[PDB]
C-alpha cells in the first residue's frame, strides 16, 4: 500500500495503538498522559498564545479528534479547529507544582473531549508557565517536539498580528490509520508479506510467560492505578568509557549492551532464562511525510532473549545483539496487535507480552522547547507520567564537548502497587553495579556477578 493522502471513508478507523489506548482509558486509575509545561520569561502575547494554540490543532487533525462510541464501533471523528481560550491563573513558585500536577492528572473524555489541554499560570507580569497536556492515544514523544515547534512559528506570527502562512501537512493521521488497515488487511492472502511477518511473531514469541518473575512486595490489584515512582539512576563517565569499549569488543550498541546487563540482573532476581525486554521504537525515519506530524507513531519493541548455560556478559551482548537484528525487519506488524496473534488471555492490570521496559537515548535525542519571539523559553518540570508496566527505565547517553562518554543518566519508572521505593531503588542501584562489573571485565557470567 501507498501511504497517500486518502479519499475519507464514513468511519475512519483507529490504529491498533490507539484501539488499545481507546479500551484503557475506560475510575481509580490514572490516565496515560503527555504533560509537559514551558517557563515564559518577558512580555507575553496572551491573545496571540491563544490563537498560536489553536493554530496548531488546526494544522494537526488528530488534535481535534474525538472517539466514540463503544468498541466494536470505535472511530476517528475529526471536528473544525476549536477555539482556546486562555484565563491566566495566579500562581506562585511553590503551589505552582501542585497547580501543573491537577491539571496533569484530570483525565479525559475520549468520546466527547478534545484528547489535548492547556493553561497558562502567571507567576509575575512578566513570567509564566503554559501547561500542556496530551493523551496518548494522539501523541508520543517526538510529537511534542513537533508540538512547540509549530506553536512557535504560529505564535511568531499572530504576536505580529498575523496568521501563520505555513505548507499544510502532506498528510494527517486519518490518512496513516487507513494506511494500516488496508496493511493488516494482507492477512487474507495466504502468501502475502505482512503474514510473513506475523508467522514470525506468533513463533518468536511464543511459550513467553504470562508475567514476568520480579521482586514484587505486593499482589497485583485487580484494577491498576497506574501509580508511578521515580529513582534517579546513574552510571558515571568513567565507567560508561570503559563500558562503551565492549562495545567495539561485541560489535553491538550500547543500548544492547544495557540491555544485556539488565537481562542478567533479572535472571539473579529469579526471573528464569526465559526473559522478555520491551522498548519504544521511534517513528520510522525513512518515512519522511511523518516526521513534521503529531500523533503515537511511537512503537513498542519486545524482544525475547534467552539467559541459559550461565552465559558470559559478552554471550548475552551477541544473543541480544541477533535477537533485535531478526526482529528489526518485521516491524509492520503493530506491537498492539501481537497479542491477538498470539492468542493471549490479555488483563487489564498489566501490560502484555512484557512488563519490564528499556529506553537508551543517544540525546542526538529528547523533545526541544522551541524558541517564542522575545520571549526566554525553557521546559519546566512535571510530575511523574502514569506507569504501564511494572519497571520502566528511561536512560540517557550523555557526551562532552570532546563528544566522549560522558556517562548513562535517567531513571527507574515503577508501578508503586507492586513495588516500595527501597525496592525498586535497590533495582535501580544493582542495574549499576552490574553495568559497572561488567564494564570492568565483560568475561564475567551472572554467577559471576555481585548482587545480594
Known amino acids: 500500500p501507498a501511504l497517500e493522502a486518502v479519499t475519507r471513508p464514513e468511519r475512519v478507523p483507529l490504529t491498533a495503538?490507539?484501539?488499545?489506548?481507546?479500551?484503557?482509558?475506560?475510575?481509580?486509575?490514572?490516565?496515560?498522559?503527555?504533560?509537559?509545561?514551558?517557563?515564559?520569561?518577558?512580555?507575553?502575547?496572551?491573545?496571540?498564545?491563544?490563537?498560536?494554540?489553536?493554530?496548531?490543532?488546526?494544522?494537526?487533525?488528530?488534535?481535534?479528534?474525538?472517539?466514540?462510541?463503544?468498541?466494536?464501533?470505535?472511530?476517528?471523528?475529526?471536528?473544525?479547529?476549536?477555539?482556546?481560550?486562555?484565563?491566566?491563573?495566579?500562581?506562585?513558585?511553590?503551589?505552582?507544582?501542585?497547580?501543573?500536577?491537577?491539571?496533569?492528572?484530570?483525565?479525559?473524555?475520549?468520546?466527547?473531549?478534545?484528547?489535548?489541554?492547556?493553561?497558562l499560570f502567571a507567576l509575575s507580569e512578566k513570567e509564566h508557565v503554559l501547561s500542556v497536556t496530551v493523551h496518548r492515544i494522539a501523541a508520543d514523544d517526538d510529537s511534542m517536539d513537533v508540538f512547540f515547534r509549530d506553536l512557535a512559528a504560529a505564535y511568531g506570527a499572530r504576536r505580529a498580528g498575523r496568521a501563520p502562512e505555513r505548507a499544510p501537512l502532506a498528510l494527517q493521521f486519518a490518512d496513516y490509520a487507513i494506511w494500516e488497515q488496508r496493511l493488516l488487511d494482507g492477512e487474507r492472502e495466504q502468501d502475502s508479506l505482512i503474514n510473513d511477518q506475523i508467522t514470525f511473531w506468533r513463533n518468536h514469541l511464543a511459550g513467553i510467560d504470562q508475567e514476568t518473575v520480579l521482586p514484587f512486595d505486593r499482589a497485583r490489584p485487580a484494577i491498576p492505578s497506574r501509580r508511578a515512582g521515580t529513582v534517579a539512576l546513574r552510571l558515571d563517565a568513567g565507567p560508561h568509557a570503559r563500558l562503551a569499549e565492549a562495545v567495539e569488543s561485541a560489535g553491538a550498541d550500547m543500548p544492547q549492551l544495557v540491555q544485556a546487563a539488565l537481562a542478567m540482573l533479572l535472571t539473579r532476581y529469579g526471573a528464569g532464562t526465559d526473559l522478555v525486554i520491551g522498548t519504544t521504537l521511534p517513528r520510522d525515519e525513512d518515512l519522511i511525510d511523518l516526521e513534521p506530524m503529531i500523533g503515537p507513531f511511537a512503537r513498542p519493541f519486545p524482544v525475547r532473549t534467552d539467559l541459559s548455560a550461565d552465559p558470559?556478559?559478552?554471550?548475552?551482548?551477541?544473543?541480544?545483539?541477533?535477537?533485535?537484528?531478526?526482529?528489526?525487519?518485521?516491524?509492520?506488524?503493530?506491537?498492539?496487535?501481537?497479542?491477538?496473534?498470539?492468542?493471549?488471555?490479555?488483563?487489564?492490570?498489566?501490560?502484555?507480552?512484557?512488563?519490564?521496559?528499556?529506553?537508551?537515548?543517544?540525546?542526538d535525542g529528547a523533545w526541544d522547547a522551541a524558541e517564542l519571539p522575545a520571549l526566554r523559553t525553557s521546559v519546566e518540570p512535571t510530575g511523574v507520567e502514569a506507569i504501564e508496566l511494572d519497571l520502566a527505565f528511561a536512560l540517557t547517553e550523555r557526551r562532552n564537548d570532546d563528544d566522549d562518554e560522558d556517562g548513562i543518566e535517567g531513571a527507574l519508572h515503577y508501578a508503586a502497587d507492586l513495588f516500595d521505593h527501597d525496592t525498586a531503588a535497590s533495582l535501580a542501584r544493582r542495574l549499576v553495579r552490574v553495568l559497572e562489573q561488567v564494564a570492568e571485565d565483560p568475561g564475567r557470567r551472572i554467577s559471576d556477578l555481585d548482587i545480594l
Open 17 to 119: 495503538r490507539q484501539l488499545r489506548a481507546w479500551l484503557l482509558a475506560r475510575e481509580e486509575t490514572r490516565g496515560r498522559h503527555l504533560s509537559v509545561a514551558l517557563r515564559l520569561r518577558g512580555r507575553l502575547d496572551v491573545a496571540a498564545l491563544e490563537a498560536a494554540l489553536r493554530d496548531v490543532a488546526a494544522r494537526h487533525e488528530i488534535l481535534r479528534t474525538t472517539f466514540p462510541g463503544d468498541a466494536q464501533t470505535v472511530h476517528q471523528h475529526i471536528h473544525d479547529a476549536a477555539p482556546v481560550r486562555l484565563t491566566p491563573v495566579p500562581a506562585t513558585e511553590e503551589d505552582l507544582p501542585a497547580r501543573l500536577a491537577e491539571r496533569g492528572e484530570q483525565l479525559f473524555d475520549l468520546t466527547r473531549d478534545m484528547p489535548w489541554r492547556c493553561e
Open 312 to 363: 558470559t556478559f559478552l554471550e548475552v551482548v551477541a544473543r541480544v545483539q541477533e535477537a533485535v537484528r531478526e526482529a528489526r525487519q518485521h516491524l509492520d506488524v503493530p506491537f498492539e496487535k501481537i497479542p491477538e496473534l498470539l492468542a493471549l488471555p490479555g488483563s487489564l492490570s498489566r501490560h502484555p507480552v512484557y512488563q519490564v521496559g528499556l529506553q537508551v537515548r543517544e540525546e
